[PDB]
């Protein structure tokens, strides 16, 4: 290599005192070609390649250096028809046999189709995609194809050959370089992945990206976003204790002064309403007293939100969520009458009567269980004059009577019913109106239903 | 006349002749051709494949300010950013004058690709919901690739970004330059958009992660975009698994059968899924059994019981970490089913035990000893619970339950009685995944004994590999 820097000053001597190029090809080229033909190095970290793919549009020189530097045994050269005249000198200067593929100067999709094909033929080995020579469109197209296909062919790399008195760079300072894709090159991009996952309800994955953000920049503003996603993850999983824990710790940090400007403080109102809702639900889970109207509302709203998200692609699960919501809501109506349970035969016959007319059956052979079912309970609330439940017409109540009778015969409780998503809708709508009443009997802050905007 | 293609075409012919007469191309092009070419683009900006409105354009600038000036005019944006090497900063006043636009320059090293990435990130945050053109016409090969790479990556988050370049076909072997009025500003397509069948890679990736609904959407979406009906068969396979994981066994069976019916035909004799027809037939047979049992509710059909409980246990495994409350519901329903299968070997129903006073007495004593307290005081319900069922089997000599360590049982009796107190059944229990695991581990053991007593096909636990 020291022969080069010696040879560079001599080329500079001979360029002074008058054909700048023809001295480079004569006294420099197979001197630089020599160095690359025995000790070629790939930056920033070296490696070899089974296969290499080159665009050819300008001149064989820099390409030939890249073919050497990649050291692959299988070489493909994508050339413009113009550039075919350079293949002999390319073959010669590299020593290798080449698979030539002709592409139009701007047939970018031809590049796309070729890379797809070559990756399919070599799906499991390192492949180098070299964009050093060609039109802007060709180099760009090959880079685009590589980074795109890296998602499915992780061993793909995108490479290019990197280069005053003379109109040229110094002949020893060329390196073969790997072009970094955007993920590996931008530290803060994981914040975009996290926000996208957040918006999809992938809260667990959003939290992991936000936590990793902290380790990649040191910026603790991302720790608060991790708590936020963890709160929603735990909440959606019905782990109310963990959600309250994380929500508390988040509200803690947003009160402190260093975080006065954090984008989440722009929605403190809705956040505080939400952490209070988790508090109420968590207390109600421990005390199990339907006198905690807030805890009942938040548990039932959460179950109904989950039922609506599962309705289409998880109907058996949605039936289960909606049954539990409707169950809690009716049980809260029973608490309004202080009876959460203890029937006088004055009622155990009157209820047998109303059930009998509702379903068009004789009172005897209506089996009134010790534990009132959904249908039993709903009818009992009308008999004892519940206002919202008395508002139902007899037709729509007869339409619900099948689904209401299936509360325990559902497949994920004790039976084998596949639900009618129309019956799942019936229960959820009935639960929805009850929930709206209970909302009027609690104070729950601003309370956006869905998660807060992240504000970036 | 006055920036028309007609003016330009004549000037080119005049330029054609003045170089055969030994004029120098560079200064002749800059004086003869160039001002007419610019005027054309100031009048009817030459844009393709389909004309488009950009609020922002972003241009790399390495060497020739001329093509960048055309690109700036063609994109027609209000806000223009120029990412220039330090060398090309001197071109900026000419570029501003040739385009009539007030540029915002940003200096970038000629091989600092990470700077392109950062600058595009900065500019997209500043312009988050408007059409943006990223023009790669001028720069080093690394500059152009980098801007294109940034454009396509960022499209995931900024769908209104487009990558563009000035396309220039050459006509003359005589005049090295391209023909003066044939430059067109072009959109560079995303490889995802441009390759009809790369959706198959997306589906396969989604399929191997268990995202069957989304795998099926990509397979179906491909049938339209390419007419290739081999991908409709893969959609059916993805739909089968998605219904199966959703416990929609009837729908799962419909899809499996429709898939076996296609695979049996001659057209699809070499479809890759025929390489795994034996496991497909086992799996569809399993779905048959579960569908029959769900209707019959007869525990004699061991295959249906096995299939249902295996599915429930698989769903418990997957929810065990992030969905403990759900995992418990799945595990309980599996254990309840497996216990009730045992009791059908003796001949009893859990809902209608038909106890005699001796068995009713014996069971109460049996349970009494386990709870080791208030013996003969806690009372047995009309339909036997989980512990109840366990005892009445363990009492009558159950092989799988008789092989149960009572201290391992000792630490399960709490779990074994929260079957209805679960938050998602009737009560308010948060689950200790340690409780789920015990229930799950117990039901696994029963399930394995039941597997012996069935005619199990291949039935690889996992879904069938795609074969491509
Ligand atoms: Ni939602
Ligand atoms: Ni699995």
Numbering used by the authors:
A (entry chain B): 1 to 18, 20 to 164, 169 to 345, 349 to 464
B (entry chain A): -3 to 464
From the manuscript:
In addition, Csm6 proteins also possess cOA-degrading activity as an intrinsic off-switch to avoid degradation of host RNA and DNA that would eventually lead to cell dormancy or cell death.
The T59A or S60A single mutation did not have a significant effect, but the T59A/S60A double mutation and K137A single mutation abrogated cA4 cleavage, consistent with their conserved roles in cA4 cleavage. In addition, T81A was about 100-fold weaker, and K137A completely lost its ability to bind cA4, suggesting that these residues mainly contribute to cA4 binding. In contrast, mutation of T59A/S60A or K137A completely eliminated RNA degradation activity. In the previously reported structure of apo-TtCsm6, residues N416 and H422 are coordinated by a Ni2+ ion, which may cause a conformational distortion and hence generate an artifact. Coincidentally, in the structure of TtCsm6K137A, which we initially determined to investigate the impact of K137A mutation on the structural integrity of TtCsm6 homodimer, no metal ions were detected in the HEPN domain. The Ni-free structure of TtCsm6 is essentially identical to that of the Ni-bound one both in the overall structure and in the R-X4-6-H motif. In the apo state, N416 and H422 of monomer-1 form hydrogen bonds with H422’ and N416’ of monomer-2, respectively, and the guanidine group of R415 is buried inside the domain, where it is stabilized by E332.
